[PDB]
Enzyme design. Structure first.
Site, PDB file in Angstrom:
ATOM      1  N   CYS A  30     -13.412   3.512 -10.183  1.00 45.54           N
ATOM      2  CA  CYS A  30     -13.352   2.217 -10.829  1.00 45.54           C
ATOM      3  C   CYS A  30     -12.299   2.136 -11.921  1.00 45.54           C
ATOM      4  O   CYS A  30     -12.386   2.828 -12.935  1.00 45.54           O
ATOM      5  CB  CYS A  30     -14.745   1.838 -11.399  1.00 45.54           C
ATOM      6  SG  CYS A  30     -14.791   0.268 -12.286  1.00 45.54           S
ATOM      7  N   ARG A  81     -13.287   0.593 -15.923  1.00 44.92           N
ATOM      8  CA  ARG A  81     -14.306   1.236 -16.738  1.00 44.92           C
ATOM      9  C   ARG A  81     -14.087   1.075 -18.238  1.00 44.92           C
ATOM     10  O   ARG A  81     -14.928   1.501 -19.009  1.00 44.92           O
ATOM     11  CB  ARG A  81     -14.432   2.724 -16.388  1.00 44.92           C
ATOM     12  CG  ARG A  81     -15.155   2.982 -15.073  1.00 44.92           C
ATOM     13  CD  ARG A  81     -15.155   4.454 -14.843  1.00 44.92           C
ATOM     14  NE  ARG A  81     -13.907   4.909 -14.251  1.00 44.92           N
ATOM     15  CZ  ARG A  81     -13.567   6.175 -14.136  1.00 44.92           C
ATOM     16  NH1 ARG A  81     -14.399   7.087 -14.598  1.00 44.92           N
ATOM     17  NH2 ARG A  81     -12.416   6.521 -13.546  1.00 44.92           N
ATOM     18  N   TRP A 133     -15.687  -8.608 -12.377  1.00 44.45           N
ATOM     19  CA  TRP A 133     -14.706  -9.612 -12.011  1.00 44.45           C
ATOM     20  C   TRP A 133     -13.540  -8.917 -11.299  1.00 44.45           C
ATOM     21  O   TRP A 133     -13.305  -7.697 -11.451  1.00 44.45           O
ATOM     22  CB  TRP A 133     -14.212 -10.345 -13.252  1.00 44.45           C
ATOM     23  CG  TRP A 133     -13.563  -9.497 -14.294  1.00 44.45           C
ATOM     24  CD1 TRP A 133     -12.308  -8.942 -14.242  1.00 44.45           C
ATOM     25  CD2 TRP A 133     -14.107  -9.136 -15.567  1.00 44.45           C
ATOM     26  NE1 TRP A 133     -12.034  -8.270 -15.418  1.00 44.45           N
ATOM     27  CE2 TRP A 133     -13.135  -8.353 -16.235  1.00 44.45           C
ATOM     28  CE3 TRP A 133     -15.336  -9.382 -16.206  1.00 44.45           C
ATOM     29  CZ2 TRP A 133     -13.346  -7.832 -17.529  1.00 44.45           C
ATOM     30  CZ3 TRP A 133     -15.544  -8.863 -17.483  1.00 44.45           C
ATOM     31  CH2 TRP A 133     -14.557  -8.098 -18.130  1.00 44.45           C
ATOM     32  N   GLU A 191      -7.329  -6.993  -4.944  1.00 44.67           N
ATOM     33  CA  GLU A 191      -8.462  -6.773  -4.069  1.00 44.67           C
ATOM     34  C   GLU A 191      -8.515  -7.890  -3.020  1.00 44.67           C
ATOM     35  O   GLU A 191      -8.801  -7.638  -1.835  1.00 44.67           O
ATOM     36  CB  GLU A 191      -9.781  -6.729  -4.851  1.00 44.67           C
ATOM     37  CG  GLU A 191      -9.936  -5.540  -5.858  1.00 44.67           C
ATOM     38  CD  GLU A 191     -11.301  -5.565  -6.592  1.00 44.67           C
ATOM     39  OE1 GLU A 191     -12.322  -5.174  -5.962  1.00 44.67           O
ATOM     40  OE2 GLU A 191     -11.372  -6.009  -7.765  1.00 44.67           O
TER      41      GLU A 191
HETATM   42  C1  HEM Z   1     -15.449  -5.656 -14.891  1.00 42.62           C
HETATM   43  C2  HEM Z   1     -14.375  -5.687 -14.122  1.00 42.62           C
HETATM   44  C3  HEM Z   1     -14.218  -4.611 -13.029  1.00 42.62           C
HETATM   45  C4  HEM Z   1     -13.072  -4.340 -12.429  1.00 42.62           C
HETATM   46  C5  HEM Z   1     -11.727  -5.061 -12.718  1.00 42.62           C
HETATM   47  C6  HEM Z   1     -13.343  -3.301 -11.445  1.00 42.62           C
HETATM   48  C7  HEM Z   1     -12.414  -2.755 -10.620  1.00 42.62           C
HETATM   49  C8  HEM Z   1     -12.678  -1.977  -9.515  1.00 42.62           C
HETATM   50  C9  HEM Z   1     -11.795  -1.814  -8.403  1.00 42.62           C
HETATM   51  C10 HEM Z   1     -10.435  -2.504  -8.213  1.00 42.62           C
HETATM   52  C11 HEM Z   1     -12.365  -0.977  -7.557  1.00 42.62           C
HETATM   53  C12 HEM Z   1     -11.747  -0.545  -6.214  1.00 42.62           C
HETATM   54  C13 HEM Z   1     -12.814  -1.057  -5.263  1.00 42.62           C
HETATM   55  C14 HEM Z   1     -12.229  -1.308  -3.923  1.00 42.62           C
HETATM   56  O1  HEM Z   1     -10.985  -1.334  -3.807  1.00 42.62           O
HETATM   57  O2  HEM Z   1     -13.036  -1.502  -2.993  1.00 42.62           O
HETATM   58  C15 HEM Z   1     -13.632  -0.572  -8.100  1.00 42.62           C
HETATM   59  C16 HEM Z   1     -14.545   0.305  -7.577  1.00 42.62           C
HETATM   60  C17 HEM Z   1     -15.796   0.547  -8.121  1.00 42.62           C
HETATM   61  N1  HEM Z   1     -16.381  -0.025  -9.253  1.00 42.62           N
HETATM   62 FE1  HEM Z   1     -15.451  -1.248 -10.654  1.00 42.62          FE
HETATM   63  N2  HEM Z   1     -14.660  -2.919 -11.521  1.00 42.62           N
HETATM   64  C18 HEM Z   1     -15.249  -3.746 -12.465  1.00 42.62           C
HETATM   65  C19 HEM Z   1     -16.587  -3.721 -12.836  1.00 42.62           C
HETATM   66  C20 HEM Z   1     -17.516  -2.786 -12.409  1.00 42.62           C
HETATM   67  C21 HEM Z   1     -18.890  -2.692 -12.845  1.00 42.62           C
HETATM   68  C22 HEM Z   1     -19.566  -3.678 -13.866  1.00 42.62           C
HETATM   69  C23 HEM Z   1     -19.419  -1.630 -12.209  1.00 42.62           C
HETATM   70  C24 HEM Z   1     -20.837  -1.084 -12.315  1.00 42.62           C
HETATM   71  C25 HEM Z   1     -21.647  -1.306 -13.342  1.00 42.62           C
HETATM   72  C26 HEM Z   1     -18.415  -1.027 -11.341  1.00 42.62           C
HETATM   73  C27 HEM Z   1     -18.551   0.079 -10.494  1.00 42.62           C
HETATM   74  C28 HEM Z   1     -17.678   0.473  -9.464  1.00 42.62           C
HETATM   75  C29 HEM Z   1     -17.964   1.440  -8.407  1.00 42.62           C
HETATM   76  C30 HEM Z   1     -19.226   2.300  -8.187  1.00 42.62           C
HETATM   77  C31 HEM Z   1     -16.702   1.500  -7.556  1.00 42.62           C
HETATM   78  C32 HEM Z   1     -16.416   2.332  -6.285  1.00 42.62           C
HETATM   79  C33 HEM Z   1     -17.020   1.475  -5.173  1.00 42.62           C
HETATM   80  C34 HEM Z   1     -16.801   2.171  -3.856  1.00 42.62           C
HETATM   81  O3  HEM Z   1     -16.655   3.429  -3.861  1.00 42.62           O
HETATM   82  O4  HEM Z   1     -16.751   1.462  -2.804  1.00 42.62           O
HETATM   83  N3  HEM Z   1     -17.277  -1.788 -11.489  1.00 42.62           N
HETATM   84  N4  HEM Z   1     -13.799  -1.202  -9.298  1.00 42.62           N
HETATM   85  C1  LIG Z   2     -18.220  -4.423  -9.381  1.00 41.52           C
HETATM   86  C2  LIG Z   2     -16.835  -4.578  -8.804  1.00 41.52           C
HETATM   87  C3  LIG Z   2     -15.808  -5.246  -9.454  1.00 41.52           C
HETATM   88  C4  LIG Z   2     -14.576  -5.345  -8.809  1.00 41.52           C
HETATM   89  N1  LIG Z   2     -13.545  -6.003  -9.362  1.00 41.52           N
HETATM   90  N2  LIG Z   2     -14.389  -4.840  -7.576  1.00 41.52           N
HETATM   91  C5  LIG Z   2     -15.376  -4.169  -6.950  1.00 41.52           C
HETATM   92  C6  LIG Z   2     -15.180  -3.600  -5.568  1.00 41.52           C
HETATM   93  C7  LIG Z   2     -15.635  -4.628  -4.521  1.00 41.52           C
HETATM   94  C8  LIG Z   2     -14.842  -5.928  -4.555  1.00 41.52           C
HETATM   95  N3  LIG Z   2     -13.767  -5.700  -3.562  1.00 41.52           N
HETATM   96  C9  LIG Z   2     -14.062  -4.637  -2.614  1.00 41.52           C
HETATM   97  C10 LIG Z   2     -15.440  -4.147  -3.072  1.00 41.52           C
HETATM   98  N4  LIG Z   2     -15.557  -2.705  -2.946  1.00 41.52           N
HETATM   99  C11 LIG Z   2     -16.868  -2.109  -2.864  1.00 41.52           C
HETATM  100  C12 LIG Z   2     -17.077  -1.727  -1.413  1.00 41.52           C
HETATM  101  N5  LIG Z   2     -16.291  -0.553  -1.108  1.00 41.52           N
HETATM  102  C13 LIG Z   2     -16.432  -0.020   0.230  1.00 41.52           C
HETATM  103  C14 LIG Z   2     -15.765   1.337   0.354  1.00 41.52           C
HETATM  104  C15 LIG Z   2     -16.265   2.001   1.611  1.00 41.52           C
HETATM  105  C16 LIG Z   2     -16.087   1.379   2.855  1.00 41.52           C
HETATM  106  C17 LIG Z   2     -16.539   2.000   4.019  1.00 41.52           C
HETATM  107  C18 LIG Z   2     -17.179   3.240   3.936  1.00 41.52           C
HETATM  108  C19 LIG Z   2     -17.366   3.870   2.693  1.00 41.52           C
HETATM  109  F1  LIG Z   2     -17.980   5.082   2.626  1.00 41.52           F
HETATM  110  C20 LIG Z   2     -16.903   3.242   1.521  1.00 41.52           C
HETATM  111  C21 LIG Z   2     -16.606  -4.048  -7.561  1.00 41.52           C
END
Ligand code: HEM
Ligand SMILES: Cc1cc(N)nc(C[C@H]2CNC[C@H]2NCCNCCc2cccc(F)c2)c1
Ligand code: HEM
Ligand SMILES: Cc1cc(N)nc(C[C@H]2CNC[C@H]2NCCNCCc2cccc(F)c2)c1
Ligand SMILES: C[C@H](O)[C@H](O)[C@H]1CNc2nc(N)[nH]c(=O)c2N1
Ligand SMILES: C[C@H](O)[C@H](O)[C@H]1CNc2nc(N)[nH]c(=O)c2N1
Ligand SMILES: [Zn+2]
Lengths: 409, 411
Positions: free
Chosen positions: A108, A111, A280, A285
């Site tokens: 993320c 953070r 947000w 994305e």
């Molecule tokens: C507040 C603005 C936030 C931004 C701009 C942001 C940004 C991102 C981005 C760009 C990714 C890449 C995800 C992807 O490409 O699929 C990501 C992954 C992730 N975010 Fe954040 N995030 C935000 C808030 C949060 C919050 C509030 C949480 C939890 C309390 C969180 C937890 C996670 C987790 C667990 C992942 C990895 C998800 C995965 O492995 O599929 N995020 N985040």
């Molecule tokens: C909380 C928050 C904020 C933010 N800006 N952005 C995010 C990621 C969200 C939104 N835009 C993509 C989605 N990402 C979370 C889903 N990610 C799937 C990754 C995946 C896929 C298949 C198999 C796997 F083992 C893992 C979360």
């Protein structure tokens, strides 16, 4: 044992000490790096060390490490595990656990915000209708009329694992996907299988390009049920370009609230299998991945055509030109409608600042470079030049099997 | 053991068995991934196993494993080691070994080319002047008037580590970088230290923005010696834009031949500390990194200025806009002058094809994702969507410290 990471643009070097607390394994070995791989109940005996490790970090964080309240709490939990075979988190521990699950999410980029997370305690929830009500309130609170606020809503923890709470949907708000007789796909292809489980559970699909999916909510290990989020709680942005008047004719829109709902939150060995959380968007994305992935909405071909670019040779960089514009349009549209969005320059700049804080203040920050670097203009954002160490800390968010592979009817 | 890699655009699943032949360590543990860290005298004892393993590799590939000629060659290398403490590669083995180092280069997106590689043997070389000469011939052959050809020149291996052949330049052709009193830089900022050294050694510095540096060459562990590449051997491309006529007035050019010279080639236990090698550029190397990194020529501001982009908020994507145009210009300029260059779409698509072929024929292909994915437009290139496995095969190219840090001066 003590590790250095260097920024190759600034020559600033940081020492990581926080990695020596990592417990869980990475997928890598001395022989092989699995860095680019997307994916590489507890008994009474397993649960207690986990609880102790967590409570220890909690009481240290409130500068009451080794105090009588610390020792007493450790006693009370151990006693509860011995007789009930699980335990309940205090509200304060739950708020702390959630926030640190985010602090620890190595993938993320956002953070820097970790401490400003609104935790909704939904452990008293018992039914799917209850889950729905909690969710709509989360969705409304977080959306905040476009001025988005980070939030997580936490449903009851797993018990014997036959009584799981699960949000089936992968995000609270996503668009349906339909396979057409034509052989192609209308809507989001990422969602076909799920859309089919919605139609097979009962949903009337409007069969559009942008159909907001119904929620499939499972309480206490019961069969899941469908609910429609009140349409007026789903803030969507129509996509237009600040120079190209024809851009709106593409029919494009996206939702404002990114809210992941398929992950499992682990605090002190307790497993919260339904824990939808939201913040947000970073612009890329939507503009880069959602719109331009070949397996997603895949609109590069159509956009380039409207800008009248030379699509005969890859070397004209027509894809790259069209990509920039699509992403300009996303940002512009969200801004014009006052819906919070962050661009990749801003986000990564902020994650750099956050790394520096985590290094001086915690001695480290687990970061996954492959996910932190944005899917466009990598090397012009500062995270590209920054060495990162990746390791798994707890509390944490984890992936978990799609419930339909698992739950029987 | 059978390890799987998934491509997430296409769902193609590949099975790696070749990582089973990896010996060297990665820097990673079950507890930590160092996938994004840039940089994470042998005895008789360890040498024969490395030789044996290498020659088993060679002999298998030529379909002679276990043959009298294979067994004779093992015996002969064995003898040579215990008698002289080192050994000499046959010409065929050097060729085979240098090709394989490239094949095994996991940070290299260009490897579909690996079997077409021009090996020049400079193991009879003895002096710096010998090295200058061998390098010129390399530059000319490889340049081929713009129709670039891949090459490597291999100087004598390390002996006691006191008699090393070093090319001190990081690439055979690079531009000087000059640090001014006022703190700015003229020329390439990444070559500042190495320019200082050259000045120090005697080079009269022109002190402009694209001064092609001299070679600083060490033979036989001796102090290194200056030399000028004949300018007529240095092919350059002035950069202009197909639509933007003001672009040429930016004053930019680059050289056509990228030729890495500071790396160590390991074959069957032997260390060739001088093995400059060259291919041709993918556009982004120049247009994204060399021009647009903040630590390099850093022309983004000046380009976006001239395009009159809205530069008052990062959210206009003014940087992303200028970056694309510059990269268009680079490829345009090279194509127009008939100097070989490849764009990042074509390069990455080729590599996927290569990688798939490698799994099918060889049982794997190690690959470093952090390096393979281009520094612009990541997810619109198919490599981004490709899971990869990184591991270390020999023969191999490795980093080595900078000669000026280790060299013991004689005077
Ligand atoms: C507040 C603005 C936030 C931004 C701009 C942001 C940004 C991102 C981005 C760009 C990714 C890449 C995800 C992807 O490409 O699929 C990501 C992954 C992730 N975010 Fe954040 N995030 C935000 C808030 C949060 C919050 C509030 C949480 C939890 C309390 C969180 C937890 C996670 C987790 C667990 C992942 C990895 C998800 C995965 O492995 O599929 N995020 N985040
Ligand atoms: C909380 C928050 C904020 C933010 N800006 N952005 C995010 C990621 C969200 C939104 N835009 C993509 C989605 N990402 C979370 C889903 N990610 C799937 C990754 C995946 C896929 C298949 C198999 C796997 F083992 C893992 C979360
Ligand atoms: C022929 C066209 C080739 C192209 C387009 C190409 C492309 C690339 C690129 C884009 C990189 C990443 C470099 C960077 O950004 O610093 C790289 C690295 C590398 N290439 Fe290739 N390459 C080619 C040929 C070769 C040849 C002939 C060799 C040697 C026989 C080679 C060996 C390597 C090695 C060892 C690296 C790693 C450099 C490092 O780790 O610093 N390549 N190549
Ligand atoms: C043969 C060949 C062909 C090609 N297209 N491209 C190349 C890489 C060259 C050119 N463009 C960049 C450079 N890459 C090789 C040198 N790169 C720096 C690696 C490095 C840096 C700092 C500390 C370290 F420990 C290591 C080689
Ligand atoms: C194969 C590779 O791991 C995969 O494409 C990753 C790469 N980096 C990513 N980075 C982010 N932020 N999100 C993603 O979905 C991915 N996908
Ligand atoms: C810190 C990080 O590993 C570093 O900036 C790397 C990332 N990927 C790269 N990829 C290539 N091809 N070349 C580079 O110089 C780098 N730099
Ligand atoms: Zn790793």
């Amino acid at each position: 044992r003590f590790l250095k990471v260097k920024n190759w643009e600034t020559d600033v070097v940081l020492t990581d000490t926080l990695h020596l607390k990592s417990t869980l394994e990475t997928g890598c070995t001395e022989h092989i790096c699995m860095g680019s791989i997307v994916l590489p109940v507890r008994t009474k005996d397993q649960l207690f060390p986990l609880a102790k490790e967590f409570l220890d970090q909690y009481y240290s964080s409130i500068k009451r490490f080794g105090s009588k309240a610390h020792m007493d709490r450790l006693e009370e939990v151990n006693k509860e595990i011995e007789s009930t075979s699980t335990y309940q988190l205090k509200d304060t521990e739950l708020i702390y656990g959630a926030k640190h699950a985010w602090r620890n999410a190595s993938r993320c980029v956002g953070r820097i915000q970790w401490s400003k997370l609104q935790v909704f305690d939904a452990r008293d929830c018992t039914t799917a209708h209850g889950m729905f009500n909690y969710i709509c309130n989360h969705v409304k609170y977080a959306t905040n009329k476009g001025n988005l606020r980070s939030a997580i809503t936490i449903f009851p923890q797993r018990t014997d694992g036959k009584h799981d709470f699960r949000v089936w949907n992968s995000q609270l708000i996503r668009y349906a996907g339909y396979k057409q007789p034509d052989g192609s796909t209308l809507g989001d292809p990422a969602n076909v299988q799920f859309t089919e489980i919605c139609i097979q559970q009962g949903w009337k699909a409007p069969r559009g390009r942008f159909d907001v999916l119904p929620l499939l909510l499972q309480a206490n290990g019961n069969d899941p049920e469908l609910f429609q989020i009140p349409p007026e709680l789903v803030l969507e942005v129509p996509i237009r370009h600040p120079k190209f008047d024809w851009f709106k004719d593409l029919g494009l829109k996206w939702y404002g609230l990114p809210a992941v709902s398929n992950m499992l939150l682990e605090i002190g060995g307790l497993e919260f299998s339904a824990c939808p959380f939201s913040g947000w968007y970073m612009g890329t994305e939507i503009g880069v991945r959602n719109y331009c992935d070949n397996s997603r909405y895949n609109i590069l071909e159509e956009v380039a055509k409207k800008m009248d670019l030379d699509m005969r040779k890859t070397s004209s960089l027509w894809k790259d030109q069209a990509l920039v514009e699509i992403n300009i349009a996303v940002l512009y549209s969200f801004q014009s409608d006052k819906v919070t969005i962050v661009d990749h320059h801003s986000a990564t700049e902020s994650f750099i600042k956050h790394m520096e804080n985590e290094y001086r203040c915690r001695g480290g920050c687990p970061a996954d470079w492959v996910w932190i670097v944005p899917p466009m203009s990598g090397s012009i954002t500062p995270v590209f030049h920054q060495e990162m160490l990746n390791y798994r800390l707890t509390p944490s968010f984890e992936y978990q099997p799609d419930p339909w592979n698992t739950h029987v009817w």
